[PDB]
Design a protein around this nucleic acid. Structure first.
Lengths: 113, 348, 240, 274, 104
RNA sequence: AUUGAAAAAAAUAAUAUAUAUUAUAUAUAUUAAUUAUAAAUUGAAAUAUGUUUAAUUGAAUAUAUUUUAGUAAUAGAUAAAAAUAUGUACAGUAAAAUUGUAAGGAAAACAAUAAUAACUUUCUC
């Protein structure tokens, strides 16, 4: 009837497809609808507040950098040139890694190289 | 719990039905929804899981934020800032949302939707800006009602009209709709719903209906005729249905005359215009103004000069259209007017 | 005004940050909502027909109720397609030793040991060192040579203070901020470094500086650092 | 049609208008996609993202400190060059093209708190050349992208016509998927955690790669895709596997900023920079 | 001569019914080389995986690691057969016996 | 309506019923469905009737009936590769060139490449 490759690919296409593979639409009562709206509204505000707190911290950090640069330049230009040098090829140490859900068996290392 | 107390907050910021409030504030999933009536449908319905715990914390989060806003609102003195702060404090109350989205906003009842509260005023403004204002201005634009009558309009108050006396059937008139001579044969009423903070103990309004389509065979053009004119009308946020109850014969600067089109004279547009009188300070009570009935042509009426002379600011408008039918003759004799003229079917 | 270099070391978190109560419950709510809208599992593809694993999975699962004429159903006529009710979520039940995740609370947490680098895995630790007095502060190192960049001076001086038992990274030569003092006419420059391996282990027996150290976080930095010193550095730390 | 002349009539009001909201048709597009009432609704913040958190916790402040240049100024890009006014022929002359390029280039602003190099999207391009004969193989690409990335793959069809290559225009050959947000974060993490540290001769991403203004790209061979967890588990059902292209888009103004940024997410670099 | 499966009448997803694609996925725990475990959202139905080799045991990703155990695919070869079949001849002292050919 | 929980209502819209007017309106009741449509000795699941084990009841167990499996792409008012080339309504902007990317090179596919003054909303000091 149909080649085995087509049968296999039809199944793979079936896994892609949405035919007879989705539930009924999510219907909420009028009062639960208001319930959901207030949940999202808080989450939206909460995320905005966290974002603004981070931005304000970075505002101050930059303020601190420039005041440090201004003072270093006026006092000792010898160090300022080194500080203002570019970091075009700077790379984070690969030993630093994104946090993992659960810690490793060995928490830390006291030997290097 | 600022939202729980009612020492100074209006009662309108609450769910009148107790069963609804009990479910919305239920501590455990033990009460069935009130909205779904049939018990069979009640059994079939399944609320989403873990929706009560998160709602309670979300409610607390807003509660604290509202309290901060109210405290801030207490220390201010500017009424405009005060209103903005109040709207900002309570806009997030689930009760306020339930009261507004779920109950009539046009014929609002003082218990649920009170338009004296800034929050319901703000929500009503946004709602009208979504659909009603958008539809109105399109009708006024594509029908060339604006430039013919006034340079422009900047809406600030929903306007609705009806003809309850003509036939006895209730139907709010959609702007630009086509109305027979019988339906518009007796009188219109208005519902000038305001949404902007205004001194409703001092402010006064005027209502003019104009028809800039009457043939003018002298100049081979058209001339504008005043249809209905009222001056010095008081209003209230929750009671603003202008009707013979709320005005006397002194306010009528031009008694209503029916739309009476002539045969083959083309469609005629009747544009309702609602303004507001000047607000002069340093005086107690409203600033009554005596309209000059002397000129008041009402046959060749120039709205632009009328507005300029009396310094009126337009805030809302409405429009309907009328053509000739068999009932026009009956309307003419009912109002004791000369029989209408009959024109040709072609332009030459 | 003499220039004085300070260095703030940071221990990056080793485990993911803990979630607040609002975050935990909101995420659970969304996941359940997603499961409600979740699609059918295409078991007919992963599990081939006749495979023993396939038949083991079938028994591992619980079938749905099917529509049947002449029998009433209170919650509604079943709607099953591909062997799953469409009116609610679907549950799919699933050396090869079982994966046992390690505990997120270590020994240093229960023992309340302050010197260790594991006291707070999900937070950021900063090396705060006490002076001759009880005033705890970030290490301030004084230079006079000026023949080396300030960040390099702090790095080399730190290694000799720890007995070459530390591995620190110099994030940048740009000092983070200034802690100026008018009494002694001292200008202090703070440099951001990251600890990679080893511990501090003060070993300088000449009593040149410092007596005690710690690996506190921002919450604990506040209680040990004086308020005036804390105020001028609150923004240079990491909340989580 | 009586005429073909497009001329919109001017309006007499300032109110913005949108016929979609006041047309009764399609009552469900009126709801926003994020709204619960929309059939298009899909939860977004199902769970916390560890990679994003890392960037916002540690790499955010670090990058600001790295890239900061004291009293740096905006470097204007190569824009169109105006015509000097010395002849009566410049009044309506279109402006000249940029100096060395036929396309305008953007400005480069100093890095500040608001603009810190960060990720924005990741695009997987997969062009199975062998599909020219067997179209059925292109479907396997969509499945492979689906299983690995975890998002719906948008298919790739031919656009050009090269007879030397038996290439025909208007045929399906591959699939592509746009990744954003948490799902992109998972892909980037699982790429460096699992797939990348499994190539015998792997040295890293070339420093020469990358669009001038942000954006870094590399490629995975056919055999590298076997290293993904969702193919390693079912090797029986994956007889044929084949490579793809990866493109990481970021908010970096220049490339070198992006390379420093991506290094924080455990990405190695080996070559020499420009 | 191309192999193309014929296309059936595409069903009409009329406006407003465009539901998103939410593919079935499992909260699957990924066990690294060390005890580190990361939760990954995957489609394949089984909750735990061990990674024989991963970033943990890769020198490129851990330049500072002095001790680094190395393990590769176990399909057949040295670790499999050369060891048990030759379990008497032992050592890298023995590697110094065949160290150099001393040829120019 | 019966079916585990212990007097109601005040929105738009849909459906059912009814009736006011030379007005496609109003009153009441309730919030269905929203990716489907014949055809399977064989795969999966389900309920009912018996048995054996393990009062109830878990498992297996034979039969009857039914449901799933015909596994097929667009999930976006989709937007410069292919097909519907005349009507209407809504919406969008191409192309070259450059820089990169496993096979890939001059030529296959993907990604990036002009500036935010003023305005609205939200968060924040």
């Amino acid at each position: 009837s149909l080649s085995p490759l087509a049968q296999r690919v039809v199944t793979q296409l079936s896994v892609m497809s949405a035919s007879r593979k989705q539930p009924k639409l999510l219907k909420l009562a009028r009062e639960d609808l208001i319930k959901h709206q207030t949940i999202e509204k808080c989450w939206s505000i909460y995320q905005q507040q966290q974002r603004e707190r981070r931005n304000l911290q970075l505002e101050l950090q930059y303020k601190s950098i420039e005041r440090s640069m201004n003072l270093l330049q006026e006092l000792s230009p010898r160090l300022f040139e080194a500080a203002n040098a570019s970091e075009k090829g700077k790379r984070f140490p690969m030993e630093m890694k994104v946090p993992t859900d659960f810690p490793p068996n060995t928490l830390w290392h006291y030997n290097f190289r | 719990h600022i939202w729980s107390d009612f020492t100074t907050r209006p009662s309108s910021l609450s769910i009148q039905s107790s069963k609804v409030k009990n479910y919305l504030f239920q501590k455990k999933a033990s009460l069935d929804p009130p909205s779904i009536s049939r018990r069979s449908n009640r059994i079939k319905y399944s609320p989403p899981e873990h929706i009560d715990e998160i709602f309670r914390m979300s409610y607390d989060f807003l509660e604290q934020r509202s309290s901060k806003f109210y405290e801030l609102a207490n220390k201010t003195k500017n009424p405009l800032k005060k209103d903005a702060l109040l709207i900002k404090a309570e806009i997030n109350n689930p009760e306020v949302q339930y009261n507004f989205q779920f109950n009539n906003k046009l014929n609002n009842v003082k218990d649920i939707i009170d338009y004296d509260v800034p929050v319901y005023r703000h929500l009503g403004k946004q709602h009208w800006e979504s659909y009603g204002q958008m539809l109105l201005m399109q009708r006024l634009e594509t029908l060339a009602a604006i430039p013919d009558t006034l340079p422009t309009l900047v809406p600030r108050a929903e306007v609705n009209i009806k003809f309850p006396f003509s036939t006895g059937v209730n139907k709010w008139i959609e702007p630009g709709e086509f109305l027979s001579s019988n339906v518009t044969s007796m009188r219109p009423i208005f519902k000038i719903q305001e949404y902007e903070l205004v001194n409703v103990e001092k402010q006064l309004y005027t209502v003019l209906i104009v028809n800039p389509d009457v043939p003018d065979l002298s100049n081979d053009s058209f001339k504008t005729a005043l249809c209905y004119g009222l001056v010095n009308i008081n209003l209230t946020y929750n009671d603003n249905l202008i009707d013979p109850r709320k005005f006397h014969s002194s306010n009528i600067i031009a008694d209503y005359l029916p739309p009476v089109p002539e045969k083959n004279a083309g469609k005629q547009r009747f544009v309702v215009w609602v303004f507001r009188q000047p607000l002069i300070e340093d005086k107690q009570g409203p600033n009554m103004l005596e309209i000059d009935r002397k000129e008041l042509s009402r046959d060749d009426f120039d709205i632009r000069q009328f507005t300029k002379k009396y310094n009126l600011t337009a805030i809302g408008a409405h429009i309907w259209r009328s053509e000739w039918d068999a009932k026009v003759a009956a309307v003419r004799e009912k109002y004791g007017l000369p029989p209408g003229r009959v024109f040709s079917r072609v332009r030459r | 005004p003499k220039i004085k270099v300070g260095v703030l070391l940071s221990r990056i978190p080793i485990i993911k940050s803990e979630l607040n109560e609002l975050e935990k419950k909101y995420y659970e709510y969304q996941s359940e909502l997603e499961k409600r809208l979740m699609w059918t599992f295409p078991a007919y593809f992963y599990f081939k027909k006749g495979t023993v694993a396939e038949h083991k999975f079938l028994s591992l699962q619980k079938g749905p109720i099917s529509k049947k004429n002449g029998i009433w159903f209170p919650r509604g006529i079943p709607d099953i397609k591909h062997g799953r009710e469409r009116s609610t979520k679907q549950e799919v039940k699933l050396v090869n030793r079982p994966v046992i995740p390690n505990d997120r609370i270590t020994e240093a947490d229960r023992s309340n040991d302050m010197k260790s680098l594991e006291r707070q895995l999900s937070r950021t630790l900063y090396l705060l060192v006490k002076d001759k007095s009880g005033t705890w502060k970030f290490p301030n190192f004084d230079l006079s040579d000026e023949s080396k960049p300030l960040h390099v001076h702090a790095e080399n001086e730190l290694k000799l203070l720890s007995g070459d038992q530390i591995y620190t990274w110099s994030v940048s030569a740009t000092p983070i901020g200034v802690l100026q003092d008018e009494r002694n006419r001292t200008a202090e420059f703070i440099v951001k470094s990251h600890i990679l391996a080893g511990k501090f282990d003060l070993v300088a027996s000449k009593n040149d500086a410092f007596e005690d150290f710690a690996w506190l976080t921002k919450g604990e930095i506040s209680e040990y650092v004086p308020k005036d010193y804390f105020n001028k550095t609150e923004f240079l730390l990491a909340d989580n | 049609p009586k005429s073909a002349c497009s001329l919109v009539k001017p309006v007499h009001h300032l109110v913005k208008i949108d016929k979609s909201k006041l047309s009764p048709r399609f009552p469900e597009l009126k709801y926003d996609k994020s709204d619960i009432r929309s059939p298009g609704f899909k939860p977004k913040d199902t769970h916390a993202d560890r990679l994003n958190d890392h960037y916002l916790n540690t790499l955010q402040s670090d990058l600001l400190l790295i890239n900061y240049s004291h009293n740096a100024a905006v470097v204007k890009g190569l824009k169109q060059r105006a015509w000097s006014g010395d002849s009566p022929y410049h009044l309506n002359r279109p402006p000249k093209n940029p100096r060395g390029s036929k396309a305008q280039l953007p400005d480069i602003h100093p890095i500040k708190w608001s603009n810190i190099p960060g990720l924005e999207s990741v695009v997987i391009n997969c062009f199975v050349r062998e599909a020219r004969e067997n179209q059925l193989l292109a479907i396997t690409a969509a499945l492979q992208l689906q299983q690995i990335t975890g998002c719906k793959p948008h298919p790739i069809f031919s656009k050009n016509d090269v007879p030397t290559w038996k290439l025909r225009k208007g045929h399906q050959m591959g699939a592509k998927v746009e990744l954003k947000g948490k799902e992109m974060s998972q892909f980037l993490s699982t790429l460096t955690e699992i797939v990348l540290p499994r190539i015998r001769e792997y040295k890293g991403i070339s420093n020469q790669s990358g669009n001038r203004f942000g954006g870094i790209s590399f490629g995975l061979t056919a055999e590298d895709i076997k290293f993904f967890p969702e193919i390693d588990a079912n090797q029986d059902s994956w007889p044929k596997t084949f490579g793809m292209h990866i493109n990481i888009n970021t908010s970096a103004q220049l490339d070198y900023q992006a390379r420093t940024l991506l290094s924080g997410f455990q990405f190695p670099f080996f070559g020499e920079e420009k | 001569t191309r192999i193309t499966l014929p296309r059936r009448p595409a069903k009409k997803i009329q406006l407003g019914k465009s539901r998103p694609a939410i593919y079935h996925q499992f909260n699957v725990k990924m066990e690294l080389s060390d005890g580190s475990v990361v939760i990954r959202r995957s489609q394949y139905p089984k909750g735990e995986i061990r990674l024989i080799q991963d970033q943990r045991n890769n020198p490129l990703w851990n330049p500072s690691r002095d001790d680094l155990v190395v393990v590769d695919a176990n399909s057949g070869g040295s670790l499999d057969r050369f060891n048990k079949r030759y379990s008497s001849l032992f050592s890298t002292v023995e590697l110094s016996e065949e160290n150099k050919k001393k040829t120019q």
